[PDB]
Amino acid sequence: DIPVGVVVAFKKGNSQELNRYLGEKVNLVIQNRSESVDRQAAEGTLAAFFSSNKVSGFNVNHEGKRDSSFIIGTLTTANGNFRINCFFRRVQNKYLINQIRIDKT
């Protein structure tokens, strides 16, 4: 339901490790602006985000599951905290990210 590797990747700010968990289409919602992009475009955007905001940690605060699944977590960075909501859908029995919301908190 919730890939350990995703949480590990966020904890390190490592987009390359997130890449294997990204679906082929990902809805990124950053500063309340929603864009839908392909896997490669998402991975680059996340690399930029982690490069802009040096990550110190990540903690999962809530998990939920729906037939789909999600985590609600707090990312600590050199520029302060962000709230991350990451949603997954099962593709061929593997959970893959289809939406990430990132808000500065």
How far from chain centre, in Å, is Cα 69?
13
Pairing relationship of beta strands 33-38 and 22-30 according to DSSP bridges: antiparallel
| DSSP at 67 | -
Structure tokens at 20: 């294997």
Q: Which amino acid is at 88?
A: F
Q: What CATH number is given for 1-105 in this structure? A: 3.10.450.50
Please answer whether residues 58 and 49 qualify as being in contact, where contact means their C-beta atoms are separated by less than 8 angstroms. Answer: no
Please give the C-alpha separations between residue 75 and each of 51, 84, 86, 104, in angstroms, as whole numbers: 14, 7, 12, 9
**18 burial type by CB count under 10 A (0-12 exposed, 13-18 middle, 19+ buried):** buried
- Helix (H) / strand (E) element for 90: namely strand 80-91
Question: Given CA atoms 77, 56, 2, 35 in this order, what sign does their dihedral have?
Answer: positive
In angstroms, the CA 36 to CA 93 distance is: 23
